[PDB]
Amino acid sequence: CGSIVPRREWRALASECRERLTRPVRYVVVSHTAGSHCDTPASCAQQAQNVQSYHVRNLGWCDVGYNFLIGEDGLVYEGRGWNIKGAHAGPTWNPISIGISFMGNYMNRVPPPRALRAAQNLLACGVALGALRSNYEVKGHRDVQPTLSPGDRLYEIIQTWSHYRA
């Protein structure tokens, strides 16, 4: 639908998450992982594994906190997906939003156009299959939480999206 790398394909741990999103979801929060960057399918599968591993092993979460991840390889990586409440924007925003995270620190870098396309494609695919509302609003992670996520450069770009609302 949006050429999503399925969890099994990036060697993900089984989720234990039970809490469900009330589709059709109104909000999208854009974060960065503030993790390593990756620009090949091989490297970006490993980074998704690395991110999930911190969340599950270290923070003791039911799964990677993000609904989806974006690599500089220009592929979307399935996280908790369309139906399961995320852990990415704190308790107010988690239950009423889909969290997508660009894999990297984008304070002093931009994602490549292909990473940006993958995210816009993902969200359309969201609306297409009825997971996101037609009129969904995109928010920066820093617009709902005290953080520099998604990074100054990435935040500047998402500000220009037709669906962005400060």
In sequence order, the β-bridge partners of residue 78 are 68
The one among 39, 49, 62, 163 contacting a copy of itself by CB under 8 A: 39
The one among 42, 58, 146, 166 contacting a copy of itself by CB under 8 A: 42
Residue 111 makes contact with a copy of itself by CB under 8 A: no
How far apart CA 73 and CA 66 sit, in angstroms, is 18
The one among 10, 27, 61, 155 contacting Cl ion by CB under 5 A: 61
Residue 157 makes contact with a copy of itself by CB under 8 A: no
Within 69-98, the residues that bind a copy of itself by CB under 8 A are 73-75
Q: φ, ψ for residue 150 (rounded to 5)?
A: -90, 20
Indicate the residue among 61 and 106 with the shorter CB distance to Cl ion.
61
Site string for a copy of itself, 1-20 (x = CB under 8 A): xxxxx---x-----------
Tell me the residue length of the chain.
Answer: 166
The one among 24, 35, 41, 95 contacting a copy of itself by CB under 8 A: 41
Could you tell me which of 103, 88, 102 has the C-alpha nearest to residue 36?
A: 103
Beta-carbon count within 10 A of 129 CB? 13
Instruction: Report the sign of the C-alpha dihedral through residues 136, 141, 144, 148, in that order.
Output: negative
Could you tell me which of 30, 113, 103 has the C-alpha nearest to residue 71?
A: 103
The residues binding a copy of itself (CB under 8 A) are 1-5, 9, 39-42, 73-75, 112-114, 117-118, 120-121, 124, 128
The residues binding Cl ion (CB under 5 A) are 61
